[PDB]
Inverse folding.
């Protein structure tokens, strides 16, 4: 009937998923406890489910789309493969949020020279397949300890000698006196689709959503810069701030000496050149938002 | 009262949107979660947070100046007062662009519905007994009313009633309770209302100022400022696809005699519907920027 | 410390605005009492407001965002113990506005500051209150309360209070009248006295350019409209821009142009009807996130 | 079917209702969100509903029992009567909790105030029917202002000159600079039953529950007191602490001079006589709970 | 080191576990808690992780549902392991049934043939369906299993039921019970130190005391001496009634008897018929045979 | 000032235990989460909920009558007031049986504190201890989350409250030296109360004593052979001596009842069974008086 999208029930990843859908024009009036939501303007249903359950729903084709971390997706792919299955899906887009590293970590006091220091250790993780593959590949024997949450407390708790867990800022490792020693997997959120072909109408909607997703991602760190400069300085200013193609050049009232120039720029690059712009005579410099860009 | 007084809902999505609207209209305020009276820090305005069902009566009695409330709640209370022999009045200033919902009759999915006569003699649970009563009496359907203040959707399962009359936006709550929406009896959105009795000249002048801004906000809702590059020779075709609110702005590009920038205001969904055709006609570097207010 | 360290308030509206300011200055973070920026070498320490000045005075954090009132209260406390606290003021910011004021029950008669003579006065800012009363030669009994100061008169803890006021709602809620303002405050960005490394100072400099950009754009919008060419001078007189209007051609139109001007938003609304009288149409108000001279 | 009991969804009254049912042998697990609960040991369903909705459900006979404040019950009775209905119900028991006074209150002035001070005032209340009846009965004209909550803020908000609202401790009135001037109604929680006769099996269960309710209520504020005293002091001690019938008298090991005495007592009465008990030679005085008492 | 007890992080089972430990004399006030009066550490962990910690011997004791224990036992066995533990006590809380359920509107188990069935307990479901020769498609969901049919994620579910309210709220009918569970207290297989085992033994005496007292009360009443035998026949006590003199009274006595509370209420009117008065019901916190 | 005024903590386990104690002493009240002044509904008593650190000063200045507060907070504030030249005083009514904690010096996992920056919320208590032991240090006053200071590089060490030790362990800190031990106490302002207020305090205090004397005691009942009375009495003596009660139609066995500390009971329970005890019951005691 309607296109079905599975998203995470909780975490920063869930909030960013809802925001992405909203920016892609999916209106939804969603109670905190509602597990199935129905878009009010598009034929789309949103299913809020535990992250670890999303890959299996996509593998089995009972939802159409999913937003999920690569780590969770591959963990579950490996699990299904280990049982003799052949899970498949389509990767539509690697997204610009949910960034993390799956890393081996040890108490700060422990001595680490190389990977062989994990030989024979109990290692606590929520990703036992990803860990198993890596340790097999490197020929390191270890004892697995599967924990669903609070993995960082396992060494202190004496449930394990070490951990393999997700790191973003590194604050959680530090708070628990752990040192990140080896990155085994890098992940971000991705948008995936079931393998079996959709109806023409559903696929057409996916295509429309994907155009907007690309628009959002393209605009993400970019702003629309406006400024005034002497006409004679056009070339110097263009060399510093080129725009996505070339500056727009706009007349100013009763002024034949100066113009307004407009350029799209990544914001951090703008700030890195702002003083040189002033040195070349730029004034009244404005930074405006861009919600979507299509190049 | 020295200062203009505005009543808004204490809770719900409607309350958050009311606060946001006031903020976009230049009313600075800090509403702590507990604070029931807030004072604007930049304008002579007091904001009273009150239960939605109480707001119409405060306006009818003239003890607040303005109110933001759902049409459904307003009319439910208007009907209640009229049933008691009163003549409530107010001024409708603006139908707003949030708080959308339908008040609908709904039945368990298993129940057979052919027409309105299937509600004959049923117990119907609702929080809007006056709106329901009017509709059923207009259609000559007898029924037994069951007033419930909340969780109306659970009444059939709970065996408190055979059916319900409740607000629907997405339909998720009906589906979650195995209910089918059968007949819409009322459609509602948030509105801004004013008491009947004339305000002082200074208060009315402030209302007038606020209303100019409210119109600006509402006219901009769902519109964006589109910018793009195109070959000069394509201007007529691109203008046909994306006309702007009057006509495209045409802007030169540095050291380029072949291409220009074109800027147009567009409803966002119309923009997306024509975006591929724009690319087919040579458009590139297409940007979508927000518009906060628009005056035609 | 390898990384630049910034102390911000753990709670309050001031805390949320501090986080937003840092975000608008390009500091990505997911905020936990210590947070690590994911894109810049910056650590954010969330601490009780009253503790921030001391950390800056002692040089164990590099930057702090704190109310002027809290900063001066702690400066006075340290000075009273014989110390010489110092810091660098980087910027007076545009949020956290409040007044520290003497207030009395509405029934109490107030003619002069002398009406506080001999009263018990409850406050969370005993140093600021002490200085003011000493300066005005008013004797009083201090009552230090850490929170809910507004309830002290009703609770019979004190005859009066000295507390922060923003909207005045809390005083009204408690049947109190604001009688005398003793200190006005807003948030400020401060730095420790001892010189930073060249790399840290360079980062602070970068952040400060952005802070100025944010503050200069506050309340300004980018206005666009259409008008007859012959009306340019009248419209420019009403809405001049930050320098002068941008003037743009319209498709297949030789009579009308688009005009764009930066304007403070309230000034815009005050001239909008005159703009329409002079033939302006399709008037748009767009946001500006930063503005630089 | 099963016996159906409506209780309040929130408030101290809701917690006390659940506790009473538990002490009457009704086992149930009410999840925070669950609106219908099913007792696991008895054929009883518990419906959690807004207080103001309970009377109507009892009047219409669609639940069997209800626990509700007298004030809410009578307010709704008057409202239904005003619409031409004939609500009825059976009062089973006036309960031990939910005590409050519905009172007229005015902003504090430094001057005695009284009932006649309400002539012509706007009075805010959530109980317009109870207020109306009282004012009519006392021939006081006034203007009604119905507010569903936070009635205490109405004078400060300038929505009314005065209020009629519930008072328990008086703290809320004092916090809002209001003076309680006239009590118009006194209320406690009640257990009520629908008018139409229940099935024999349902009525038999109600009868069982009611025996227990009486047991609980009868025991409230009573304790089982035990003490040692010289045999010669029996009569003096019995005069001070008589028991519900007469003291139990128990031998002590290898002691012909002293006995243990046990007496049920209201706890406050116990504390009021405790020093006189010691003066008469009582020692090792214990206060034990009593969960139910039957005459 | 200190005795280590793993308990659930959340759920009613978690609260009852804490309560039981408190009634057994363990004072405590966080994912690792340290008892303030005994050498005991309490680890709060997700229920599904507890069995593995016991199997591997890295905690000493655990309080966990039988269902979760057996689910994990089966999982480990399916991987070729030989998990073991000691069952110390089947406890008196955490009751639930793991049941197959279907949308309201089933003749027999063959109606599940070929269905997609959503569950959080795939090993328990798999074993049952294999044993009954029913083919099905598994759908593993970690939570909110009851929404799967409505969400079109599965045709049916296999989930825990206590009161049945959740099934009814989702228009589901409980059709077949496949496993019944309560909380149990378990211990790792490898022997503890003498000191740790001695503490476990102490705790277990108290656990028995708590369980034996559950639903029993201490009944006291007055009756005419001549009615002793009739009253004893109705309310016998755990051994025989205590008989106590009343002040200056040769005609009546107090009688005290332990009774299950529901049995007491069932005979209370007959007690009054036989002349009982001033009947009191007092709590009992522990009882030992 | 018509009614007796009692200040209690606004939050913390101490706050809950304070409310529970008052309730067990017969003070009925409904403290809404927000309410800062509560009025007892059955006694002329007002309860003021205030931040712990503010309570001592209110008692010192005599503007509330009674307070329940940790000894640590009381003494910290006493020292602060003394350092300013004041002579704070109060009456200690009772050391209570909750709020137990240790104020301890702790380091990342005593002479080694020389010259360290030490973070604390109790700078007066720390100062006194370090002066007394002749250790120089740099004070860092933090109002909360003191345990994070070393990791945050705000200090080298801390002086903070410990109950279970979990918070120190969670932050990789080792408790090295206890400087102060504390529990909740009930205190009264120095200046004499009215006769009516003092009489109410006296009544409350009789009940407080009852509660505290019963804490950890239970009423034990059991059956035993008459011939075993002396052996059982030796194991479980009661607070004075066992109550001895006949059993229906039984000349050989009796019921015996004894008050016992609960842990002592459990320590002797197996010996009781060895001596023929059966049907052993443990009942609660809510108050006990000498
Ligand atoms: N993408 C993610 N999905 C799930 N957990 C995450 C993710 N990124 C970080 N975490 C966890 O979130 C917490 C914050 O990470 P950090 O910022 O490194 O302190 C840690 O417990 C991480 O293991
Ligand atoms: N404007 C509104 N005011 C009050 N409740 C509403 C409103 N719109 C929707 N609801 C409630 O939200 C739920 C319906 O939302 P939905 O599930 O999206 O149809 C029902 O519980 C409605 O009573
Ligand atoms: N900048 C500030 N910092 C801390 N507290 C504040 C600040 N501004 C206002 N308050 C407090 O916040 C409450 C609301 O202020 P008002 O808007 O005056 O009711 C009062 O308790 C004030 O004392
Ligand atoms: N039985 C009751 N039902 C509903 N509200 C109550 C009841 N008793 C007291 N209240 C309200 O609860 C708050 C506390 O009352 P008080 O103890 O008088 O401050 C006030 O807002 C009262 O109006
Ligand atoms: N021992 C348990 N462990 C986990 N979940 C449970 C347990 N017992 C009941 N539940 C869940 O709690 C909810 C309430 O059950 P019920 O009382 O049948 O509505 C349902 O989602 C059950 O699946
Ligand atoms: N009486 C008390 N007053 C204030 N804080 C306390 C008290 N007892 C313990 N704490 C704090 O409560 C937390 C828990 O203590 P612990 O049980 O040792 O982890 C720690 O942050 C202690 O500093
Ligand atoms: N011409 C500018 C800005 C712009 C892009 N698209 C439309 N205008 C650039 O190339 O960056
Ligand atoms: N000229 C364009 C853009 C614009 C509107 N207003 C100012 N500029 C349009 O009519 O849409
Ligand atoms: N030229 C207009 C708009 C503008 C500012 N900067 C760039 N463009 C003004 O001076 O306000
Ligand atoms: N005989 C005592 C205690 C008691 C009552 N019932 C049983 N025992 C009394 O009359 O109060
Ligand atoms: N003798 C009573 C009460 C009792 C049990 N244990 C001690 N006393 C009974 O057998 O039930
Ligand atoms: N006689 C017993 C029980 C008891 C105390 N007080 C009254 N009875 C004892 O001395 O412990
Ligand atoms: Mg999994
Ligand atoms: Mg109404
Ligand atoms: Mg300070
Ligand atoms: Mg405050
Ligand atoms: Mg702006
Ligand atoms: Mg009603
Ligand atoms: Mg209220
Ligand atoms: Mg598992
Ligand atoms: Mg202090």
């Amino acid at each position: 009937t309607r296109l079905r999208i599975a998203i995470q029930k909780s975490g920063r990843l869930s909030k960013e998923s809802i925001e992405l859908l909203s920016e892609c024009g999916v209106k939804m009036h969603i109670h905190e406890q509602s597990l199935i939501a129905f878009s009010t303007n598009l034929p789309i249903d949103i299913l809020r489910v535990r992250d670890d359950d999303i890959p299996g729903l996509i593998f089995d084709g009972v939802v159409d789309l999913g937003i999920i971390g690569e780590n969770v997706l591959e963990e579950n792919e490996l699990e299904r493969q280990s049982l003799g299955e052949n899970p498949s899906y389509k990767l539509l887009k690697k997204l610009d949020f949910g960034y993390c590293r799956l890393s081996l970590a040890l108490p700060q006091e422990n001595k680490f020279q190389n990977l062989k220091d994990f030989e024979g250790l109990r290692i606590a993780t929520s990703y036992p397949q990803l860990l198993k593959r890596f340790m097999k590949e490197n020929g390191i024997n270890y004892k697995n300890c599967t924990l669903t949450g609070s993995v960082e407390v396992a060494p202190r708790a004496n449930l394990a000698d070490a951990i393999c867990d997700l790191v973003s800022s590194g604050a959680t490792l530090q708070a628990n006196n752990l040192k990140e020693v080896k990155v085994i997997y890098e992940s971000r959120a991705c948008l995936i689709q079931k393998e079996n072909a959709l109806s023409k109408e559903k696929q057409a909607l996916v295509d429309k959503i994907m155009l907007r997703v690309a628009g959002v991602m393209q605009a993400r760190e970019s702003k629309y810069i406006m400024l005034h400069a002497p006409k004679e300085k056009l070339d110097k200013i263009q060399a510093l701030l080129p725009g996505v193609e070339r500056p727009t050049i706009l007349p100013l009232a009763h002024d034949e000496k100066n113009v307004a120039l407009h350029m799209v720029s990544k914001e951090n690059l703008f700030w890195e050149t702002m003083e040189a712009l002033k040195e070349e005579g730029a004034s009244s410099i404005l930074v405006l938002p861009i919600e979507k860009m299509l190049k």
Notes: Residues 198-217 of chain C form the longest helix (20 residues). Residues 121 and 160 of chain C are 5 Å apart (CA to CA). Residues F 53 surround magnesium ion (ligand 21) (CB under 6 Å). Chain C touches chain A through 35 residues (CB under 8 Å).
